[PDB]
Design a protein around this ligand. Structure first.
Ligand code: NI
Length: 149
């Protein structure tokens, strides 16, 4: 195993919401600890491939930046992340995606698991898996956001 770290915080002015997805498990990774105090999620990741989903929101700016990063972990414990996608848009539009009936579910779910005020977000025990592989999946999200934006 190897310990990794992302941000999950929702304050007065901004919100940084990062979740990490398991490429193999085809659903989000169950985090071993959450840090309400410093607004952080702590993961114990089997060496493998992982997508990190980033949502960054300046509320007062009605600003939302959504990213997707590829997180590669080797058996030597070495971590390397890279962004593969990024877009910037109105937060109001992003909050609207939650209620979009015909949308990329994992996306509608990520958004939906955003952190409650001053709390962190959380992930639930699951064996559930989406239909598509990580490529299709990412692409479906991209294809949508473009039409959405
Ligand atoms: Ni490798």
């Amino acid at each position: 195993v190897v310990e990794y770290e992302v941000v999950s915080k929702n304050l007065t002015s901004k919100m940084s919401h990062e979740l990490l997805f398991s490429v193999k498990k085809r659903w989000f990774v169950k985090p071993f600890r959450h840090d309400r105090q410093l607004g952080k999620l702590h993961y114990k990741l089997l060496p493998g491939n992982y997508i990190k989903f980033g949502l960054y929101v300046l509320k007062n700016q009605d600003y939302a930046r959504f990213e997707i990063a590829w997180v590669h972990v080797d058996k030597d414990g070495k971590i390397e992340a890279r962004t593969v996608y990024s877009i910037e848009t109105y937060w109001h539009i992003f909050i609207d995606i939650e209620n979009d009936l015909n949308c990329p579910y994992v996306l509608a779910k990520f958004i939906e698991m955003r952190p409650e005020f001053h709390k962190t977000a959380w992930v639930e025990e699951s064996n559930y898996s989406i239909a598509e592989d990580d490529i299709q999946m990412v692409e479906s999200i991209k294809r949508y956001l473009e039409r959405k934006i």
